Paper text:
Aminopeptidase N (APN, CD13) belongs to the M1 family of zinc metallopeptidases, also termed gluzincins, which comprises enzymes of medical interest for infectious and autoimmune diseases, cancer and hypertension. Mammalian APN are type II membrane-bound ectoenzymes that dimerize on the cell surface. We determined several crystal structures of dimeric human and porcine APN (hAPN and pAPN) ectodomains, which reveal the dynamic conformation of this protein. These structures identified three distinct APN conformations, based on active site accessibility, which we termed closed, intermediate and open forms.
The human and pig APN ectodomains share 79% residue identity, domain architecture and dimerization. As the N-terminal and middle portions of the hAPN and pAPN ectodomains are heavily glycosylated, we produced them in CHO cells. The extent of APN movement nonetheless appears to be sufficient for release of the hydrolyzed peptide N-terminal residue, which is not plugged by domain IV in the open or in the intermediate APN conformations. The TGEV (transmissible gastroenteritis coronavirus) spike does not bind hAPN because it lacks the N-linked glycan recognized by porcine CoV in pAPN1516.
Residue numbers in the entry: 63 to 891, 894 to 967
Write the structure that this text describes.
Amino acid sequence: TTLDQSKAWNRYRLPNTLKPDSYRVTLRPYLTPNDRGLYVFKGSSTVRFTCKEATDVIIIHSKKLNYTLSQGHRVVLRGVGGSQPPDIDKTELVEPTEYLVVHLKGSLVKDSQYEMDSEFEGELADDLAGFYRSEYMEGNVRKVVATTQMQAADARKSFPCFDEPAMKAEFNITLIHPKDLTALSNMLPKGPSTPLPEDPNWNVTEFHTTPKMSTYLLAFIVSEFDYVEKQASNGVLIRIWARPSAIAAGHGDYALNVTGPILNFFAGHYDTPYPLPKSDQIGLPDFNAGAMENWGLVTYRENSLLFDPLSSSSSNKERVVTVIAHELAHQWFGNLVTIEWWNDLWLNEGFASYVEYLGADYAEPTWNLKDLMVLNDVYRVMAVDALASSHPLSTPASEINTPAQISELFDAISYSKGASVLRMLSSFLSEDVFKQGLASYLHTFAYQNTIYLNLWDHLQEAVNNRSIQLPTTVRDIMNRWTLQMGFPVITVDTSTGTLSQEHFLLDPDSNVTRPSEFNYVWIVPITSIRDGRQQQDYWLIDVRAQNDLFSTSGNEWVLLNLNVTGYYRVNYDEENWRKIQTQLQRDHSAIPVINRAQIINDAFNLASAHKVPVTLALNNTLFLIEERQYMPWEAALSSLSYFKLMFDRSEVYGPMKNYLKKQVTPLFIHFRNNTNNWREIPENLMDQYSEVNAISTACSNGVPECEEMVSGLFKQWMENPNNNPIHPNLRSTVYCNAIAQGGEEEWDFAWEQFRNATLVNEADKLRAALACSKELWILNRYLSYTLNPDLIRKQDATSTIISITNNVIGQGLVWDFVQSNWKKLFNDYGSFSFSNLIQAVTRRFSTEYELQQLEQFKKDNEETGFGSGTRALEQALEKTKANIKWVKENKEVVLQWFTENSK
Ligand SMILES: *[C@@H]1O[C@H](CO)[C@@H](O[C@@H]2O[C@H](CO)[C@@H](O[C@@H]3O[C@H](CO[C@@H]4O[C@H](CO)[C@@H](O)[C@H](O)[C@@H]4O)[C@@H](O)[C@H](O[C@@H]4O[C@H](CO)[C@@H](O)[C@H](O)[C@@H]4O)[C@@H]3O)[C@H](O)[C@H]2NC(C)=O)[C@H](O)[C@H]1NC(C)=O
Ligand SMILES: *[C@@H]1O[C@H](CO)[C@@H](O[C@@H]2O[C@H](CO)[C@@H](O[C@@H]3O[C@H](CO[C@@H]4O[C@H](CO)[C@@H](O)[C@H](O)[C@@H]4O)[C@@H](O)[C@H](O)[C@@H]3O)[C@H](O)[C@H]2NC(C)=O)[C@H](O)[C@H]1NC(C)=O
Ligand SMILES: *[C@H]1O[C@H](CO)[C@@H](O[C@@H]2O[C@H](CO)[C@@H](O[C@@H]3O[C@H](CO[C@@H]4O[C@H](CO)[C@@H](O)[C@H](O)[C@@H]4O)[C@@H](O)[C@H](O)[C@@H]3O)[C@H](O)[C@H]2NC(C)=O)[C@H](O)[C@H]1NC(C)=O
Ligand SMILES: *[C@@H]1O[C@H](CO)[C@@H](O[C@@H]2O[C@H](CO)[C@@H](O[C@@H]3O[C@H](CO)[C@@H](O)[C@H](O)[C@@H]3O)[C@H](O)[C@H]2NC(C)=O)[C@H](O)[C@H]1NC(C)=O
Ligand SMILES: *[C@@H]1O[C@H](CO)[C@@H](O[C@@H]2O[C@H](CO)[C@@H](O)[C@H](O)[C@H]2NC(C)=O)[C@H](O)[C@H]1NC(C)=O
Ligand SMILES: *[C@@H]1O[C@H](CO)[C@@H](O[C@@H]2O[C@H](CO)[C@@H](O)[C@H](O)[C@H]2NC(C)=O)[C@H](O)[C@H]1NC(C)=O
Ligand SMILES: *[C@@H]1O[C@H](CO)[C@@H](O)[C@H](O)[C@H]1NC(C)=O
Ligand SMILES: *[C@@H]1O[C@H](CO)[C@@H](O)[C@H](O)[C@H]1NC(C)=O
Ligand SMILES: [Zn+2]
């Protein structure tokens, strides 16, 4: 499986002998099939490169490209500035390393430039890689758009190139396309699209030269899309593309309104202007990758770019602002200054995942979006990073070579832990000094490439220049958070005022085998409060220490990690927990809203880790009966979802629902009178989210008044279908519960609304809600639909199946389905997420019978692998073993607790 490593063309990393300067690329997509039923694109290119060290071979990336021979060879070599290229000996293609290899009869000379001409063609496949095709239905008409996805190593699939991020170059892009179609790229066209002289049916669009940039950020799109535009004061043209009908109705308007302000924010937050003449953002009906930050032409999944104020919810709105903010952040951080190699992906994706909140907050200052990062990124990644199977943020460059190894880095660790760690960094340094660090870093390395130590250097300079006191260097502090996996749990003893830290692990029976330089002790910044008042900062530099900041006497209490800015969990002594609970009972508002969620989330997590009694966590939810903020409720609901997954098929679920029924009812009554009987929605975003959770928790836990009103609204809709009386914020929870309470009539109505849907946001809500039927035959019939591309789009297959197994009645149904035709499923679905299916179907597993079924599932499907889901299967087995143990230990205690507190 390994080729001769002594040969440069058998090594995954490019050699350092040749460095490109300028490319010219002409592409011509054919949007109709040929004789072999293949969509093909024709291409021609020229790469001008500099010989940095004398070499007798040209090694360049090439993937699935078929070359037209010219002058006897795959390629033609020319000189520039009087250089004399050697004759070509022969060319070959090396598939594993994805190289075009041009062997020369002599050596290129050092410092001299050369040009290589190539003429080729490739498949315009339905594969979402390189230059590919995307198909959607515009009514009964089948539309085809040629578009691109280069990240991380697929630029080489559209034209031959030195396809590594630090091989920056300039690109002259020309698109040959049908007459009535718009061509788009990174830069603006040099002029109006002109007819191809050989065939007026085609047009030629030549784009201006790009600045120095990485191949993975290139973009070519040919479509019949329309646009809304808006020109900013500083000259930057802002355009937004989508299907003509979607833009005609104004669904691109909101994205347009926020793009300007977001670009303005980043211009100031970075202290460098927007480096491009324009900003294109395009919404594609099909785009599994979510969004790609191509420089000047950012591609989005349609349902994340388009917005309809008459049917899209606030979450839909929040989705748009935050995603746009993320990708636009890359237009400086990532595109202007690019990573040296893929092992530093966490710095790029982590930074954008963090500042997406800052940008979006600028566009919508009334929302307080920044507060949501703790739930969305911090606690999300903490579930995965608290496992023995996690990995450090940073990876040695030499360990990331193959395309598969690169793809594995695009995970929750890189994004969410990357964001969390950087937010913590911007916290213990002043944000102002963090900004100052950013500014110099950007200016210094513009149009170039960096490793993460470069950013550390510039931040360190800002620290010295601003005279910010730290326990040690920025480098040494951050090493604790990048070189080793996981995060600490800080246990506080408020009697002695001593702090203690250790590697936090969700599984009490975990087996960490990955060694660490520091042996899992961190240098950690501690912000804290006492009786609502914030104290002086502290630095924990050892396993254990003492300070009077964490000592208490009498009725006073303390709390660590203000607003959860630090990437760690906190535990307290029994005495301190009691005072905090008493504070929550007396006046919970005295504790920051984020920290109220912390108290709950940490407690439930520490409970699973055998660090607090499970009854403690449950006690930390008692105050929720008078809690009206969204965040603390959401945190408890998220943690109790595990309890639901463990107990919703047992005797425990009864008292559990009765408890949640007791806690949420006053909140439900409140919103009922607050919104004046659901006539209005709150003006504050959090309150809007809070109301939705209240209604959602009320109905699923059996409060009568909620059940009556959701089915009442839905029947009212069934009578006025073209006049949906249900506010968008409430649609998912109302559709679902009404479908659950009703039967065939409701389901068929919802199904027809889904089939006729012209708004993707609405169709997504219907798809999920349809899985809420309590009729087994209906769910069974729905299951058969999920594999039919005419009924359910393949990109929505897994999620629709997943939504079905979320239903208790669908659990055994889907699990039987997975066991029955896995062999047919692994063959006849590509990009079907077996990983998510395996995880979703095994979440409920808590018995020895389920484990043995899963153990047999693995054995029965040995010779036919599990592919991308192979890893999820091993984690499901370990999780199942953990669940069996947890259930047998907490079943009695939890049943008793829910019973006592349901009265
Ligand atoms: C991708 O696209 C870029 C941008 O268009 C191309 O770069 C251009 O390439 C042109 C063709 O070689 C260049 O034209 C030449 O410019 C020479 C002057 O060079 C200076 O360039 C700097 C900027 O780098 C300016 O500040 C100076 O003011 C000058 O413009 C001329 O001397 C040269 O002379 C011509 O030679 C031709 C040869 O046939 C004669 O026919 C003609 O009569 C005339 O004597 C010529 O005009 C151009 O400078 C250059 N533009 C820039 C800004 O770099 C890349 O070549 C493209 N890449 C690929 C691989 O195709
Ligand atoms: C650049 O060159 C590469 C390498 O040659 C091309 O890749 C090749 O693509 C073809 C599809 O056109 C693959 O062919 C196979 O097709 C069968 C199914 O179709 C079959 O058609 C033949 C007649 O040609 C019949 O005799 C058979 O009964 C059958 O109907 C399918 O079973 C295979 O899975 C495969 O798709 C071929 O495998 C593939 N070659 C390699 C080695 O990758 C590529 O198309 C070309 N690019 C362009 C732009 O044409
Ligand atoms: C969170 O921590 C625990 C969670 O359970 C709570 O402790 C509970 O506090 C109440 C306070 O009223 C205790 O009630 C007491 O119970 C005794 C009798 O003991 C009982 O005996 C029967 C058998 O006869 C057992 O089945 C019970 O388990 C219990 O041992 C009775 O005289 C009074 O009702 C007395 O108040 C309750 O026992 C206790 N739960 C436990 C430990 O089982 C705690 O309050 C809560 N903290 C909060 C509210 O924030
Ligand atoms: C995208 O941004 C545009 C531009 O701001 C928004 O359009 C504008 O929306 C406002 C608020 O509804 C409208 O204000 C109105 O002004 C009139 C006076 O002209 C006043 O009588 C009304 O009471 C109201 O306040 C304004 O007409 C409108 N401007 C344009 C260009 O039509 C739009 O709302 C934004 N779109 C989205 C979905 O965010
Ligand atoms: C492709 O080229 C043709 C010919 O230049 C363009 O057709 C012109 O389009 C403009 C704007 O719509 C019309 O006002 C002219 O009458 C057309 N010129 C003719 C008839 O020769 C066409 O616009 C180009 N396609 C694109 C991408 O717009
Ligand atoms: C902790 O986070 C809270 C938000 O959960 C912050 O409270 C906001 O602070 C900003 C400062 O500009 C005010 O404009 C907002 O009105 C506050 N929101 C609310 C609803 O209180 C708070 O600043 C943070 N505390 C610290 C010091 O870290
Ligand atoms: C940086 O700090 C130094 C003093 O430490 C001083 O020159 C001035 O305050 C700042 N200006 C720069 C960038 O030198
Ligand atoms: C969907 O739209 C078509 C075209 O108007 C119509 O015939 C059909 O009844 C619609 N389906 C329903 C029942 O919503
Ligand atoms: Zn990103």
